[PDB]
Amino acid sequence: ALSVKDPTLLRIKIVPVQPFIANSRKQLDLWASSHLLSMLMYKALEVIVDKFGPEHVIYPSLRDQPFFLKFYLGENIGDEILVANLPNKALAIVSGKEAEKIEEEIKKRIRDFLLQLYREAVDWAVENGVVKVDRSEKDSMLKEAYLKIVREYFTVSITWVSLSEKEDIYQVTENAGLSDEDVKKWLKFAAIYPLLVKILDSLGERKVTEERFEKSEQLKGWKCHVCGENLAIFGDMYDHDNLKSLWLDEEPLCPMCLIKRYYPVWIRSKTGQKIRFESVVDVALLYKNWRKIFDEKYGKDLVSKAREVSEDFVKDNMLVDSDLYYSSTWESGLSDEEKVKEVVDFLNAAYKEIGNPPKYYAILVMDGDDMGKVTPQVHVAISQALANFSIREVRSVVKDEGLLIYAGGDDVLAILPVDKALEVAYKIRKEFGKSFENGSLLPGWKLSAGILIVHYKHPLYDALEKARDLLNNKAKNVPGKDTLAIGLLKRSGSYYISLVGWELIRVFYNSELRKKLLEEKGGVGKRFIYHVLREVDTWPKVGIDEMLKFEVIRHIKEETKELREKIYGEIKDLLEHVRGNNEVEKVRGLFTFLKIITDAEVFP
């Protein structure tokens, strides 16, 4: 478009984002949280579209958003729809007069929307035995105490500035404190869009902060188990034990976490779409197509023996819970008895033939550093590109390798099985690179990521905190960024971190070294890694190269000389792509990395 009266820059922000997602006990909660959030932006975005249409939304680019296709144009979209492609920030160009109305409306549009879900959620919960109570009591679930929680939880903040206004760059640059950066934009001698946006943020951050603290107090009573923060429904009324009783799975649920449980079914009704994996274990078992093969080879039988154990153990010739694949589950933690032995033993026998079951999965978080590439139209093209990358490029990579939850453009959240984590992150990175046609050696656009490998039993909220920590605190503190931070958290509690360049994936993959470790059995020198790491506890008097040379020989007949050359050569190559201020830091990083991808318990 670009022709209008009193064009105004409008910015929208929604919160909380990470804290909301973190309050998930299961992947399904995690997905619902991410999906719902995007939806909220959409609702918020609707207002602008209704009033002006897509083209006036600079960011994100609406035109291809599935949500846009499938809710504004009722096109048919399929499982494409499960992915949340909408970020929680947006900006549009709009008339000054209608702006404040837009603010009132969006706030209300989302507020009303949340209220619906709670209500449909209430009906749903009580009917399907989630809440387990006389429908007479239902009226109790809709009291102001619970309603207020839903209204107040999310703060969507709308801010705007006049794009037509009296301008002095001396004064404008002045109020915002940003000196020594004037020539690129201080210099306009021939509208200040790029500077204009950044102030908006500054302005937006002022509103969100006030508005997110206008929060009402709550009644005494037991808190939701998932979220742990808001009064569990009926929390005020009962003692804890009895209250635990009203809830299935013994999980009392606040409103905002109840909507979480209901949200999955609601999209399904709306779209007839569900995610393939409701569990991390579901994603874990993808590793080596281990599950596909096992269920097929023994899977067929497994239920009746298990079914023989319990009628409620399963429905539809399918296991209710995937963790039942793990003998350990049977072995302990179950929640008549003779059957246990044969299955356990049954399953252990199974492991004999196919190998042991993967109990580890990976969380992949990626963010674009540092955005953007600081003209409204220039902004749009970037946005369209980002939308294209997110919507199609990332989806094609993760397609069928794991669960893609969120792709807002530069940023990503995916759950992958261990064997595909590195593979996928690198691929995404490249696609991201090509999509902006950045040419090395010296790129930016740059992208950093965090890969957290966790045991399935590990609390989701904590896994998320750590994974984000890897991205923000490790990968992005590296100078130049464009880094991948890998963290292996083991059930033992041992946490291993490696920061590496992106090409390290490439080099190590297709390395003889990888092959020997992969072709490890018959194996390469055991303690190779321990020994090298030991020498890097301090500067080897011998020096790095010697020790390496030395260690490479201790572990590995005519060819053996040729082989060590290569390995030593390959190792020297990798260190180039391991982050670290010194060669000592790099050696640990590389060999810590090797330690990670070679853990038998993580990579059966």
């Binding site: 102030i199 500054s202 302005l203 006030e210 603290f213 107090e217 709550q218 005494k220 923060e229």
Partner: protein, 259 residues
């Protein structure tokens, strides 16, 4: 006020208050828990102010600009959680440090001491707890010392100025509007504008003994949060001021600053 340090060998305020509350074999209490501080081998430490951002091996203190007659913070890097010495904070509160080397920021309970400041209205806490003691923490044990000397931060002579900031040492429970409003009254002054620099609201809940269930959830401004204020007229900024709910429980300890 009495100054109570524990040697250990939020619900932090609650825990401490209760503990004292609990010690006295012999709902706020009678006494007031002004605030508490964390301690290490380096002495007292405080959550890094939210307007101090890491960059270039340095943390930059960034001050507000008045956009559209509106107080705002220049667009900068993410906050990085950390702590600073009592020494550093005082410099901060006087607007006399432009930056702090990264090494200084204290990422490092995982805690060596905890300080309690108390107004004892003849509850005889000082003489009674004064006895050199080892007391049960609300489980774990602690060594308790008590001094009648109020902390230096509490007695500082800030200038009289139109621009003041308030730094929240402890979680303050209130909506922004009420707080500034409560502020206006206690200082008996009018505030032209204010900017609150902070992370998302903290959910604080505590036990109700009599009702025998968890206390109603409240939302508090997280510690290290700073409130910048532009008064209409010159105000003698106090060294500290108590704001919001659950004061006697150690909440709402805001330290006065300038800018």
């Amino acid at each position: 006020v009495t100054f109570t340090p524990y040697d250990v060998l939020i619900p932090l305020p609650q825990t401490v208050a209760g503990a004292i509350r609990t010690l006295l074999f012999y709902e706020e209490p009678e006494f007031t828990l002004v605030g508490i501080a964390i301690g290490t081998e380096k002495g007292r430490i405080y959550p890094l102010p939210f307007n101090i951002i890491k960059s270039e091996k340095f943390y930059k203190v960034v001050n507000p600009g008045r956009f559209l007659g509106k107080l705002i913070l220049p667009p900068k890097g993410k906050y990085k959680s950390g702590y600073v010495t009592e020494s550093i904070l005082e410099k901060y509160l006087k607007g006399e440090l432009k930056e702090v080397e990264e090494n200084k920021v204290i990422r490092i309970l995982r805690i060596e001491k905890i300080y309690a400041w108390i107004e004892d209205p003849g509850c005889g806490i000082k003489d009674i707890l004064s006895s050199y003691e080892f007391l049960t923490l609300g489980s774990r044990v602690a060594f308790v010392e008590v001094d009648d000397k109020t902390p230096d931060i509490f007695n500082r002579e800030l200038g009289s100025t139109k621009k003041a900031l308030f730094y929240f040492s402890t979680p303050t429970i209130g909506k922004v509007g009420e707080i500034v409003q409560e502020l206006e009254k206690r200082l008996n002054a009018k505030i032209d504008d204010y900017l609150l620099v902070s992370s998302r609201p903290t959910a604080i809940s505590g036990w109700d003994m009599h009702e025998k269930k968890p206390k109603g959830t409240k939302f508090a401004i997280p510690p290290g949060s700073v409130l910048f204020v532009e008064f209409k007229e010159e105000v003698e900024v106090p060294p500290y001021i108590k704001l919001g709910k659950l004061k006697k429980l150690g909440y709402g300890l805001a330290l006065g600053g300038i800018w």
